[model samples]
Target: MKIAVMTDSTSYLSQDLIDKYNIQIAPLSVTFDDGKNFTESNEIAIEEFYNKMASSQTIPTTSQPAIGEWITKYEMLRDQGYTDIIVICLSSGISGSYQSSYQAGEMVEGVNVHAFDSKLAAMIEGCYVLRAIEMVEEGYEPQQIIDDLTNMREHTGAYLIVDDLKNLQKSGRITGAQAWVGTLLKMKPVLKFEDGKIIPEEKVRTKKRAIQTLEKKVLDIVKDFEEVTLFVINGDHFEDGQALYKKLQDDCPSAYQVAYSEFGPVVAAHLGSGGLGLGYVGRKIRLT
Candidate 1:
């Protein structure tokens, strides 16, 4: 029973996890108005992507993996006799990667490929893939494994604070309504992932208040899970990432799973700099 894991660039799996789980990454194409070209999780590095954003007059756009790319990877796995596959894609509502993977899954022969929409990104994406790997390794069959993993994903909650909103405004992820209000009132939006997209949950009057609010939410949702792993994912800022990571770590017991990592280019491009988020995965989360 050979099982394979695959995901898009937005997941931002570390080189260590990629090597450990043998996960494959499908790069998303990013194009600027100029002739220059780059692909998320491939051609673009974190610094270059954010640096370009700093000066570009217009925001760069993100595109899904071409159908051919998906077919190529699926066919390669099938040819290798790896008939069982699990593909965790970015939210289908947001990216075309899930749809392309589904189209490719239909073309392949004699393979059980189950595609999932994470409805989340960054390390949270990695969290789902990693948890799936653990389930299969524990001897769960494909279909049951899929159901269990999908349920577990529901328990994964995330909270993010963007210290700066310039990039969010520049990228058009937020409307001028939100941006102008944020500036006029000295508000910093604290966003959370619900259903399948990042939505604003609260607006703090300052960065300090935003951080405190973020920490409070993490603890609230994470109380039910027996084993808690907290990941502090940040943009280009390492110190701030570590600071947020530690702030949450203090809430967990020493035995709890806790770690921190930086955001990769594909995600950094979307979230922009000065963004920090706390991610949690456990058996259950608060409904509130």
Candidate 2:
């Protein structure tokens, strides 16, 4: 079957990859002082968004992709003669983009729609999208591609350390008692994505130790796989991100391919700037 793949802007995939695969995306929005909505990574660039965030008096708000946007995407794919559409979305736990895609899929007629909740965000989520690209080219059915992504969720992991706790606290993204403990102790907590929610994994006493712990936790998991995709993610902290990437490159086995990326606008809103993290998936989709 002729298949098409789609994901939300939160995937944080690089433009080269998106262009190479011809991956379709529906952008989530962010609002500035005027409340005029601008789609993340589309209407506004990441650097511009952060600059506005610094200048604005109020914290910017992010929105999920509209259901109409999803419908438009699916319809366009159908008209292009694709019989099946595979839509990978951000976690249902945090946003309604998956639900939006599913609902929009129900609205479309000519194409068979398969909306899969990656239960992940960022490049880790995009890893599934990348895999789907390979699978479609290899002649795997859409159902099989969806099933593979479901299985990949078990091995999926992401952990982040933000510059300040205030962003997460204000965004209401941090869950569990660690929120209270982190702020109360003024900790450098390691935030993890577990069962689709961003929860505090460990309350490290200092920034250095917190970063050390983050690397250790990720290294512990990467060892289990014969080969894996290791991600080094950053949020406007190039030097810090680079150092971390260098460490991972030196530590991880040659069998693993490391992907280096920065957060897009929607992610940067909640995670804040100067954040660094790692995401892991036991799959190889892109060689580079």
Candidate 3:
């Protein structure tokens, strides 16, 4: 079967990468309380989203793309001569996009479709999509790519530090009291995606210390692997992300690659700006 790869705009993949791989993307929507709506892929620019969020009197909400969006994308791919498809979606623990994609796959015909819950989000999820495209170009079968991706999940992880805890409280991810205390104490909490849910890993007294904590976490994960790639992600905090990126490079000289990426609307909505993170594949989990 001729394999085709697909993902959603939450991945924050660049247009060049999308064009080069012909990766299909369904966009998630963000709506402000003022009745303004913006889609993830260029419908609103990253800088503008942060600016609007800063000025808005109310917090914005995000929604997954409708099932029809996935159906349309599948039909388009079928028309393009693809016989099979592999869809990598945001963590089902966090969004309904995976279920929507699976349901849409069931509704479509003439193409073999498989949707996977990446169990992660943002550029961390994008890492899998990028790998799938690379494997497809190397003539790997659909099933083989899926297997590899499944194996990859076991060895991959991410951690993020949010400057604003109010967003977490608004999203119901954290208690209001916790938000208030974190803010009052000027604490930056380092959160990790564990088993697909956000959990606090550590809390530091300052942004600089938070980055320091994040770098230590990366070092712990990378030390176990012979080779690895680090993705430094920011939600309108490119300078912080770049600093972390450079720190990872300096600390992990043996790392295969260290790169920087911007977190898009879907992720930024929850982070509320000045969020920084590092994602990387870990060492093998099983000795066998």
Provide the overall lDDT of each model, using Cα atoms, as 2-decimal numbers.
Answer: 0.75, 0.83, 0.82
Q: How many backbone clashes does candidate 1 have?
A: 0
**RMSDs, each prediction?**
3.7, 1.7, 3.6
- Pick out the ten consecutive residues of candidate 3 with the lowest summed lDDT: 279-288
* Model 3 Cα lDDT, one tens digit per residue, 1-288: 688999988877778778777778999999998998888885467898899999989889999989999999999999999999999999887889999999999999999898988888887888888888888878998889899989889888898888767787788654224644345477778888887777777778888998998888877877777657778887787788888887777876753577778888878888887888888875321111
How do the candidates rank by TM-score, highest first? 2, 3, 1
Cα TM-score per model: 0.89, 0.95, 0.93
Q: What tens digits encode model 2's per-residue C-alpha lDDT throughout 79-166?
A: 9999999998999888889998999999999899999998889888888888888889899999898888888888888888986766
Clashes of each: 0, 0, 0
Best by TM-score: 2
Residue 127 lDDT (model 3): 81
Candidate 3 segments exceeding 4 Å error? 174-184, 283-288
Error of 2 at 54 (Å): 1.4
Model 2, residue 41: C-alpha shift (Å): 2.5
TM-score of 2: 0.95
